[PDB]
């Protein structure tokens, strides 16, 4: 009856981001892996070393590939983590009970894989980034851009409802990331037969200022989902301001699967 | 008017370990810098690149060297961080109001710099390290052992009085470190002229199981301190189980000494 939860952090964060949720899921009798993606958390790789979404998702892919024949998991992707999830779903659809998108960018198997990120940009004013740093590290023929959240963007757009302790923790751990637009804008890594075969659950964080609720709902209404959950009163970092409510939703998700199957 | 607190983490930890104390100190109008030492926290350096204590403390040394001519600070070293403090006190003693040793390994300018670490190891039976992982990464003529705390050692030796959240955070961020025995056991890097001129304050954490209070007291009794303070009920990780009390204590230190 127990389940294995693979938690995938968003941009500039790491496995450490789930430290409040991990204990809760484990106390419920479940297994939890709070992965560090490439150049995230304490992974010694550098951002200038990553050129594609795949390079960044490698730790997730490796875990998936390493899974046993009789071993399945529930993926939970926070924000950018939803893009990482897509890659795992396309390659290992039969090993995923379901994919949970927490206030994330949820790709689709219709348009280019950059679609969701594209819509976000076109629906989000440049003023919202505040002090976020966007530095180039690619080439004129093969351009690459890094993204590093600043203290203001973090405090007023991502952690607005979190505590100063949460803010201090993030400030000592955040590292530069990337949206990998160049790579995703000219490819279609998600197909309806594979990616689209995995059950999708979206968890809306109502008070999100980084990825506003309105855009979270647009994705659900656009690419569609199997089930939409909501955590009222949570900002972008739901695992930090509402870990218990997040836990309860994830437990119910694992349970609903057991009713239709187990 | 506020003071500048330089928080130095212990082995396998990083600047993130001070996330509960930092806000509190700042709320009091103080400046706080919780840096990552070499190959610690998010530092992109690897432990195998650290051959001596200096290389490990480099980040702290760089911070001191960058300090203004009339820029002073308060050093706070947790556990092993006490050894990193020694190097800063020996090189930039004039730029320090006082060095605070939080349940730390506090060196002296009398014996070899490895004096305190050797006493601790002799007193610490192998079983007490639990699942801690020790691995060599040097040459036969220049051996180097690495030290990486495991989950059981953390839970029952360092965080037994902390929350499951704190434990999960640590298990997700800890990285291999080293005690740098060889390097430390070959010279007296600390002198009473420089190192000894800096005021020493030791904060005893009574419930510490990693570095027992018995040993913390022995360091006070055998090397001497300007002031001995304690936080009753705190395990090894005082900044996690008793941040408010730690904060209050640090505030008095900032007040008392200049
Ligand atoms: O990954 C995130 O948390 C994120 C937040 C705001 C905007 C873009 C992002 O990728
Ligand atoms: O740095 C620590 O926290 C520590 C704890 C126990 C034993 C040796 C150590 O360096
Ligand atoms: O002190 C210990 O080494 C210890 C080890 C395992 C479980 C509980 C404990 O106190």
From Swiss-Prot, chain A:
List cystine links. none
- Give the signal peptide as a residue range, or say none if absent: none
What regulates the activity here? Esterase activity is down-regulated by salicylic acid (SA) or by tetraFA, a synthetic SA analog.
Hydrolase in keyword set: yes
A Pfam cross-reference name: Abhydrolase_6
Query: Which residues does the Swiss-Prot or TrEMBL record annotate as the active site?
Result: 79 (acyl-ester intermediate), 208 (charge relay system), 236 (charge relay system)
The record's section on Gene3D superfamilies has: alpha/beta hydrolase
Instruction: Report the pathway entry.
Output: Plant hormone biosynthesis
Chain ranges passing through the membrane: none
Which major enzyme category is it?
hydrolase
What outcome follows a substitution of residue 11 to L?
Answer: Abolishes salicylic acid-binding
List of residues binding salicylate? 11, 79, 157, 236, 251, 255
**Assigned EC number:** 3.1.1.-
Record function comment: Required to convert methyl salicylate (MeSA) to salicylic acid (SA) as part of the signal transduction pathways that activate systemic acquired resistance in systemic tissue. MeSA is believed to be an inactive form that needs to be demethylated to exert a biological effect. Also able to catalyze the conversion of acibenzolar-S-methyl into acibenzolar to induce systemic acquired resistance.
| Note, other | Two amino acid substitutions near the catalytic pocket are sufficient to switch from an esterase to a hydroxynitrile lyase activity.
**Name of protein:** Salicylic acid-binding protein 2
Q: Which organism is it from?
A: Nicotiana tabacum (Common tobacco)
